[PDB]
Amino acid sequence: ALPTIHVVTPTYSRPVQKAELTRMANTLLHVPNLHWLVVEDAPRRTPLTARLLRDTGLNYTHLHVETPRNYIPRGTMQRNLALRWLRETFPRNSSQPGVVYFADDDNTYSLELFEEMRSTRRVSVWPVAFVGGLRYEAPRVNGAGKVVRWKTVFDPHRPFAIDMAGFAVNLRLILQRSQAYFKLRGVKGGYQESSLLRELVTLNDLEPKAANCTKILVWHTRTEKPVLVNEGKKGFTDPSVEI
Amino acid sequence: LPTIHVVTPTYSRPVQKAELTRMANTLLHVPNLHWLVVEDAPRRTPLTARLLRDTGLNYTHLHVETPRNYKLRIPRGTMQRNLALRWLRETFPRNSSQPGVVYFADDDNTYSLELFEEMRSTRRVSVWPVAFVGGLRYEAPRVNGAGKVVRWKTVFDPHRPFAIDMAGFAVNLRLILQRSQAYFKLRGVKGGYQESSLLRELVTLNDLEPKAANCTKILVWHTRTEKPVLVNEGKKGFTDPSVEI
Numbered sequence: 001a002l003p004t005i006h007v008v009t010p011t012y013s014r015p016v017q018k019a020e021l022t023r024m025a026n027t028l029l030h031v032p033n034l035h036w037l038v039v040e041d042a043p044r045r046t047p048l049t050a051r052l053l054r055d056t057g058l059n060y061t062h063l064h065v066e067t068p069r070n071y072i073p074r075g076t077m078q079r080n081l082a083l084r085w086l087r088e089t090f091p092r093n094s095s096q097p098g099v100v101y102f103a104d105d106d107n108t109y110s111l112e113l114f115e116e117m118r119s120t121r122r123v124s125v126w127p128v129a130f131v132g133g134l135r136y137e138a139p140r141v142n143g144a145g146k147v148v149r150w151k152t153v154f155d156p157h158r159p160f161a162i163d164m165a166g167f168a169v170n171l172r173l174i175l176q177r178s179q180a181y182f183k184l185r186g187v188k189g190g191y192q193e194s195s196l197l198r199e200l201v202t203l204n205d206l207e208p209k210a211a212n213c214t215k216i217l218v219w220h221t222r223t224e225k226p227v228l229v230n231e232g233k234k235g236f237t238d239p240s241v242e243i
Numbered sequence: 244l245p246t247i248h249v250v251t252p253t254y255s256r257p258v259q260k261a262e263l264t265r266m267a268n269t270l271l272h273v274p275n276l277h278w279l280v281v282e283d284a285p286r287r288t289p290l291t292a293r294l295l296r297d298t299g300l301n302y303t304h305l306h307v308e309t310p311r312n313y314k315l316r317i318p319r320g321t322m323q324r325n326l327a328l329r330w331l332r333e334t335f336p337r338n339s340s341q342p343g344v345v346y347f348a349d350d351d352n353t354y355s356l357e358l359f360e361e362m363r364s365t366r367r368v369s370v371w372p373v374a375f376v377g378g379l380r381y382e383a384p385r386v387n388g389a390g391k392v393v394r395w396k397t398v399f400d401p402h403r404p405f406a407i408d409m410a411g412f413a414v415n416l417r418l419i420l421q422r423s424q425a426y427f428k429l430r431g432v433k434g435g436y437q438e439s440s441l442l443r444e445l446v447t448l449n450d451l452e453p454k455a456a457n458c459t460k461i462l463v464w465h466t467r468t469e470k471p472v473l474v475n476e477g478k479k480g481f482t483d484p485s486v487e488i
């Protein structure tokens with residue numbers, strides 16, 4: 001009966017990738033009924049990602065799709081591939097409860113976050129730290145427990161002024177709205193979340209989590225680029241040793 | 244199953260809670276682990292105290308403020324690591340045959356679960372490769388056919404006593420207790436020689452124990468976290484300062 005949480009994680013090859021996937025997997029290993037949908041931004045599945053997923057024992061699906069020359073946001077085509085995979089895997093009126101969460105590989109997630117999104121009926125929302133040039137963004141909730149706006153500074157007029165890591169969607173809505181995908185073509189920066197949510201739910205139907213959006217359970221952390229200046233042009237370390 | 248005493252210096256800054264949260268999520272998987280969190284502050288902060296209590300991990304919350312004056316060449320977290328060393332020596336009798344290992348783990352690095360099992364059996368001092376240090380993809384101890392460390396594969400001062408990062412070694416607790424005068428140096432050592440300053444008083448190259456498949460695998464990464472952009476907070480502030488992040 002416990003709903004399955006489908007975590008959609010776009011990822012790409014770069015120095016810190018294995019470290020990012022490692023601490024993220026260490027977090028996900030604590031969550032029951034979790035399906036990790038990892039979509040690599042590559043022409044084919046890489047052995048690094050394949051072996052890491054295999055060794056964790058986690059329930060996962062490993063997909064891949066390469067981003068076009070112009071590299072629109074980041075991770076878009078990968079999240080869209082995952083949405084299509086879900087629709088091809090689960091029938092529109094499926095009865096198996098599920099929740100979909102788009103979790104980037106560098107963010108920091110608390111275990112409480114997953115407990116909060118698991119009961120999502122339509123779309124749930126919560127505060128996100130380190131987004132929109134603020135300590136955190138948070139949906140505005142009235143005393144009745146309804147979402148009536150957003151507490152942000154960056155373009156507060158977007159239909160859904162919230163970051164990718166700030167909401168989850170019941171799988172049923174994703175299957176019913178079979179044509180709803182993240183916009184990549186004519187897309188204003190910061191409107192990717194709205195491009196999808198607008199087609200799935202209305203403001204008044206959002207389900208505020210994290211004690212009526214007063215607590216921060218997820219952080220939009222960024223990882224610094226490692227300095228590899230000492231490798232030189234010919235390289236110093238063994239290129240066959242995986243990092 | 245030997246207890247692993249993880250020494251983690253930490254300080255108040257925007258990403259602190261996040262760093263401790265994802266680190267706790269990793270540590271929660273490790274059995275017989277004692278987390279020695281040492282805050283760089285005048286007193287234990289409610290944020291850290293609450294987080295440690297909520298994790299369910301076995302921990303000891305200590306604190307020592309690095310003089311404001313000092314921060315204005317003293318390696319980050321030095322005084323905090325030394326406070327933990329002193330605490331271990333004042334808590335555990337020099338002789339008791341208590342199986343344990345000490346590991347200095349900074350709050351922003353990335354650790355694999357396999358790393359802890361590799362260091363848990365340490366008899367003296369164990370060493371292993373560390374990614375993203377010394378301007379390289381990784382630094383790795385060099386081992387000979389006899390199974391002994393005979394040098395270090397690095398570009399930055401590979402000829403120093405111990406050319407290895409803080410996250411690349413662990414010390415048997417008994418050894419820490421025996422060498423009661425061994426602490427990280429505060430001043431007098433060249434940049435990048437603090438790890439050597441301590442290790443040289445603890446062991447010789449020949450007594451090192453190579454881990455991580457004879458130092459051929461990377462099980463720990465010296466990752467660093469970017470500073471969050473808070474420009475939209477303005478001068479007077481936008482978000483509620485009472486809301487913990």
Ligand SMILES: CC(=O)N[C@@H]1[C@@H](O)[C@H](O[C@@H]2O[C@H](CO)[C@H](O)[C@H](O)[C@H]2O)[C@@H](CO)O[C@@H]1O
Pocket residue numbers: 227229230376377378382398399406407408409433434435436438
């Ligand atoms: C580009 C470069 O060579 N950088 C080096 C630093 O790596 C070095 O910092 C030390 O590096 C060692 C590596 O084993 C440890 O990580 C140690 O903790 C670091 O202090 C500094 C030393 O002053 O020199 C250059 O910056």
Ligand SMILES: CC(=O)N[C@@H]1[C@@H](O)[C@H](O[C@@H]2O[C@H](CO)[C@H](O)[C@H](O)[C@H]2O)[C@@H](CO)O[C@H]1O
Pocket residue numbers: 131132133137154161162163164188189190191192472474475
């Ligand atoms: C300092 C500042 O205002 N920066 C903004 C970015 O925040 C913004 O990025 C978008 O931010 C929203 C926040 O809810 C969300 O994280 C989106 O995913 C993200 O794209 C960017 C838009 O291109 O403009 C900057 O100026």
Ligand SMILES: O=c1ccn([C@@H]2O[C@H](COP(=O)(O)OP(=O)(O)O)[C@@H](O)[C@H]2O)c(=O)[nH]1
Pocket residue numbers: 009010011012040041067071074075076078103104105106222
């Ligand atoms: O070419 C790229 C750049 C990013 N990503 C992934 O898509 C998400 C976008 O995150 P990143 O740019 O950190 O996002 P930011 O922090 O800039 O919002 C993360 O899971 C990345 O691993 C990707 O697949 N391909």
Ligand SMILES: O=c1ccn([C@@H]2O[C@H](COP(=O)(O)OP(=O)(O)O)[C@@H](O)[C@H]2O)c(=O)[nH]1
Pocket residue numbers: 251252253254282283309314319320321323348349350351467
């Ligand atoms: O004023 C400070 C700066 C850092 N630290 C801690 O000491 C370690 C040093 O790390 P940081 O500078 O990242 O180290 P670097 O990546 O520069 O080696 C980390 O556990 C920090 O939380 C601290 O206690 N006080």
Ligand SMILES: [Mn+2]
Pocket residue numbers: 104106107221222
């Ligand atoms: Mn990111």
Ligand SMILES: [Mn+2]
Pocket residue numbers: 349351352466467
């Ligand atoms: Mn660090």
